[PDB]
Ligand SMILES: Cc1noc2c1[C@@H](O)[C@@]13CNC[C@@H]1C[C@@H]2N3C
């Protein structure tokens with residue numbers, strides 16, 4: 001229905017706003033673009049599903065996310081990818097792990113404060129009906 005298409009358009013407006021706020025935070029610059037295969041040819045041999053915030057906006061605009069939960073799976077993948085590629089005790093690895101945990105915790109905190117649980121449940125029920 002038109003009403004259902006309006007619900008999904010509001011979901012995309014909400015997701016774009018959360019994503020652009022994460023992308024302007026200086027702590028999360030390393031997560032704003034895909035890893036450059038030239039600088040890091042080893043990356044795509046270890047990490048099987050690369051993800052970054054520019055890819056997330058592209059996916060919002062392609063209608064890939066029908067629920068909040070769908071979107072948070074990709075935020076969780078940006079974080080898990082950084083934890084698995086950078087697992088060592090040295091300061092460069094510890095700094096990117098701390099920034100990756102902060103990106104994940106920040107996204108979940110904005111959604112807890114600013115999403116209504118009934119809007120999230122409406123999107124699930126429309127998705128399940130399709
Ligand atoms: C902050 C914030 N930004 O959007 C929202 C908030 C909450 O206060 C609220 C709870 N009931 C009405 C508010 C609208 C929406 N919502 C989840």
Ligand SMILES: Cc1noc2c1[C@@H](O)[C@]13CNC[C@@H]1C[C@H]2N3C
Nearest residue numbers: 030031035039040082085086096
């Ligand atoms: C994102 C991301 N996840 O692990 C890494 C990144 C890069 O920023 C990088 C700096 N340039 C290539 C290096 C691989 C590595 N590291 C910190």
